[PDB]
């Protein structure tokens, strides 16, 4: 009896604390989410089971560190970037698949 | 821990049918072997079977013991009573 | 023949219902059976089929022994697409010689693909001036850039991958084409933790709402 | 009477035991949600400020060149990864449609 | 028909785009490493560009000749 | 003529129905519903297939089924049986496939590789928990416990292997311990067993 009437008597009290705790937190989050509704709209889809945000998304930032002359690579990729030929190619492809949708 | 002692025996059977023989005894007497009870448990299942010959003496004890051993919280008795145990097997699991 | 025609029509309606229930339409089926006893029987089933947007061909030879069954071998052909990971997954399943998980994975991959394409079309329809079709609605990534100021650009890359067991999962990551001019301007420097934060935001409130709020912040 | 007392105390214990778990996980998940949404609000406001500042400065001086560092390199290579595959699929689609 | 002339100019531009691709050895060095090709999605290698850009020509000409351009309700909408 | 064309169409649709049976799942529409047949396989090994009866009327009910009870479906029923039935069927197909694969691995181990096993393996009906002991020939004893708590997959997430009565004396022994740990955590059971035993 004693052990039992000990062990439960705390946990339910803990419950009460947690109860009001979550209640307070709930109120807090309520007003706070109203804040993120100031500019963002109120509103199918299927969320993940917290697996999307686990792998490293910027591993490529390390991979480019392994290439030689990374700054020179940036410079030559920029001097290739300003070429209008590839821009024309891209816009032609865009126009080509524009009618696809 | 129920009162002090009880004659409990286990026997695993096919289709995960653990059969448990329980002979009850009071605080001042050896458990009686002339008034036994039988409980059939299926692993990882929401149902259990009991023969109620003298279980009306202490029903909640067996139920709470079974639910705490099964790691399940709520335990209820549906009003379904029969003698053909195999037909009960078929009807509860819709195995017919 | 009228009763036979009616029965055939009823069976065809049932088959169409099941095809909708699976989302896969098998165009052809050719069956061959041989017996090789010392009772082993080898059955070969050629079939061409298609999912909503994709077409495939496959043949498989299976063995039945007097009371076990196991596929002896299989070959399978896809169509050439950008998603080359689909082809390598097809190859891996071909060594695995597994059919049910393969087909479920293919349907899930097309279901996520259709979702991605529909969301891309919807966002392009919503704002057609700040949304740029880098490779198309059926591509892997999208890019938002300001027409007046081409210095900023934000690309969301979306890739669907297959787990070894056969589980499917999408993945979305950000990257910003940002000049260091704007980085020098404001010293807050919150772009460093942008990917993880955006992933958490998407997990909190989905993809479509996240992109809508993002483009709202670009007003 | 002590045996009955056993019955009610054990019943109360087994009833209250699960009650802790859902409340604990709800508290944890709501706290995590609050922290995440506060962080996300901070980042969205900060990025909106960055966008506004850059737009103002670009309106001040748009003709100046905009250099970029390795942080923006891999995605740009994405538009440099042109191997006609998409255009080949487009040609196949056109060939299918021409019938 | 401006498609003819845009095709002509991109075909003339093919030579110089191949040149500006062969300008550097770093883009050739990142080849063979799948660690970037699985991230970009397919691969980064354009060496048979001659074949593909000369093959699209007959197909585009053929094109210009032929001028090719809940659960209950969802289930009930099928049995009808 | 017309009869020949009708027969050709009938045999074509029958072949298509057989192909549909050979992949994914099966369904045979009846008067009161569909006795949907779910097919199970793993590693190119055909496994036992189950079926469940349906009622097409609005109060969706399962008046008959063959799936074993220890597979949880009533919770999944309250989840997605009324809404998004397609996801319901896909999820139950995944779960039955995982259970069938686990059972196939277990009984394949029991039948074939019992040669080096020193004791019976304790298995649950759902086979989420596995506990066994094995001797490999020098000779080393081990006792392994696998937790298949991720029900949708056929591979365990947490495995623990240890031995009682022998004190650690060879680093190589711990090396095979870790190797077996990785083998269970990554690759199927009988596959790695045949891999190292051979």
Curated annotation (Swiss-Prot), chain A:
Please, which domain of life does this record's source organism belong to? Eukaryota
- Would you indicate the residue range of the signal peptide? none
Question: Where does it localize?
Answer: Nucleus; Chromosome, Centromere
Ranges in coiled-coil conformation: 9-43
Q: Which residues carry this modification: Phosphoserine?
A: 84
Physiological role: Component of the CENPA-CAD (nucleosome distal) complex, a complex recruited to centromeres which is involved in assembly of kinetochore proteins, mitotic progression and chromosome segregation. May be involved in incorporation of newly synthesized CENPA into centromeres via its interaction with the CENPA-NAC complex. Plays an important role in chromosome congression and in the recruitment of CENP-O complex (which comprises CENPO, CENPP, CENPQ and CENPU), CENPE and PLK1 to the kinetochores.
Q: How does it assemble?
A: Component of the CENPA-CAD complex, composed of CENPI, CENPK, CENPL, CENPO, CENPP, CENPQ, CENPR and CENPS. The CENPA-CAD complex interacts with the CENPA-NAC complex, at least composed of CENPA, CENPC, CENPH, CENPM, CENPN, CENPT and CENPU.
Q: Which family does it belong to?
A: Belongs to the CENP-Q/OKP1 family.
Give the protein name, as stated in the record: Centromere protein Q
Q: Which organism is it from?
A: Homo sapiens
From Swiss-Prot, chain B:
The protein's location, in the record's own words, is:
Nucleus; Chromosome, Centromere, Kinetochore
- Give the quaternary structure: Component of the CENPA-NAC complex, at least composed of CENPA, CENPC, CENPH, CENPM, CENPN, CENPT and CENPU. The CENPA-NAC complex interacts with the CENPA-CAD complex, composed of CENPI, CENPK, CENPL, CENPO, CENPP, CENPQ, CENPR and CENPS. Interacts directly with CENPA. Identified in a centromere complex containing histones H2A, H2B and H4, and at least CENPA, CENPB, CENPC, CENPT, CENPN, HJURP, SUPT16H, SSRP1 and RSF1.
What family is this protein classified in? Belongs to the CENP-N/CHL4 family.
The protein's job, in short, is: Component of the CENPA-NAC (nucleosome-associated) complex, a complex that plays a central role in assembly of kinetochore proteins, mitotic progression and chromosome segregation. The CENPA-NAC complex recruits the CENPA-CAD (nucleosome distal) complex and may be involved in incorporation of newly synthesized CENPA into centromeres. CENPN is the first protein to bind specifically to CENPA nucleosomes and the direct binding of CENPA nucleosomes by CENPN is required for centromere assembly. Required for chromosome congression and efficiently align the chromosomes on a metaphase plate.
- Which protein are we looking at? Centromere protein N
Give the originating organism: Homo sapiens (Human)
Counting on the full-length protein, the chain here runs from: 114 to 209 of 339
Swiss-Prot record, chain D:
Task: Quote the tissue specificity entry.
Answer: Expressed at high levels in the testis, fetal liver, thymus, bone marrow and at lower levels in the lymph nodes, placenta, colon and spleen. Present in all cell lines examined, including B-cells, T-cells, epithelial cells and fibroblast cells. Expressed at high levels in glioblastoma cell lines.
- An example Gene Ontology biological process: chromosome segregation
State the superkingdom.
Eukaryota
Q: Where in the cell is it found?
A: Cytoplasm; Nucleus; Chromosome, Centromere, Kinetochore
Keyword Repressor recorded = yes
| Segments forming a coiled coil | 1-42, 83-99
GO CC terms in record: centriolar satellite; cytosol; inner kinetochore; nucleoplasm; nucleus
Keyword check for Disulfide bond, yes or no.
no
| Key words, A-Z | Centromere, Chromosome, Coiled coil, Cytoplasm, Host-virus interaction, Isopeptide bond, Kinetochore, Nucleus, Phosphoprotein, Repressor, Transcription, Transcription regulation, Ubl conjugation
Where is the major localization of this protein? cytoplasm
Q: Which family does it belong to?
A: Belongs to the CENP-U/AME1 family.
Q: How does it assemble?
A: Component of the CENPA-NAC complex, at least composed of CENPA, CENPC, CENPH, CENPM, CENPN, CENPT and CENPU. The CENPA-NAC complex interacts with the CENPA-CAD complex, composed of CENPI, CENPK, CENPL, CENPO, CENPP, CENPQ, CENPR and CENPS. Interacts with MLF1. Interacts with PLK1. (Microbial infection) Interacts with the N-terminal domain of Kaposi's sarcoma-associated herpesvirus latent nuclear antigen (LNA).
What is the protein's name according to its record? Centromere protein U
Q: In which organism is this protein found?
A: Homo sapiens (Human)
UniProtKB/Swiss-Prot annotation, chain E:
Q: Where is this motif: LXXIL motif?
A: 75-79
The entry's cellular-component GO terms read: cytoplasm; cytosol; inner kinetochore; membrane; nucleoplasm; nucleus
Q: In which tissues is it expressed?
A: Widely expressed. Expressed in spleen, thymus, prostate, ovary, small intestine and white blood cells. Highly expressed in testis and colon. Isoform 4 is expressed in platelets, lymphocytes and granulocytes.
The chain's coiled-coil residues are 1-30
Q: Please give the biological process terms from Gene Ontology that the record holds.
A: apoptotic process; cell adhesion; cell division; CENP-A containing chromatin assembly; chromosome segregation; negative regulation of epithelial cell apoptotic process; positive regulation of epithelial cell proliferation; regulation of DNA-templated transcription
Please tell me whether the keyword Cell cycle is annotated for this protein.
yes
UniProt entry keywords in alphabetical sequence: Activator, Apoptosis, Cell cycle, Cell division, Centromere, Chromosome, Coiled coil, Cytoplasm, Isopeptide bond, Kinetochore, Mitosis, Nucleus, Phosphoprotein, Repressor, Transcription, Transcription regulation, Ubl conjugation
Q: Tell me what the record says results from residue 13 to R.
A: Abolishes dimerization, but not interactions with nuclear receptors
Q: What induces it?
A: By estrogen.
Q: What is known of its domains?
A: The DD1 domain (also called RepD1 domain) mediates the corepressor function and is essential in the triggering of apoptosis.
The protein here is known as: Centromere protein R
Which organism encodes this protein?
Homo sapiens
Tell me the gene name: ITGB3BP
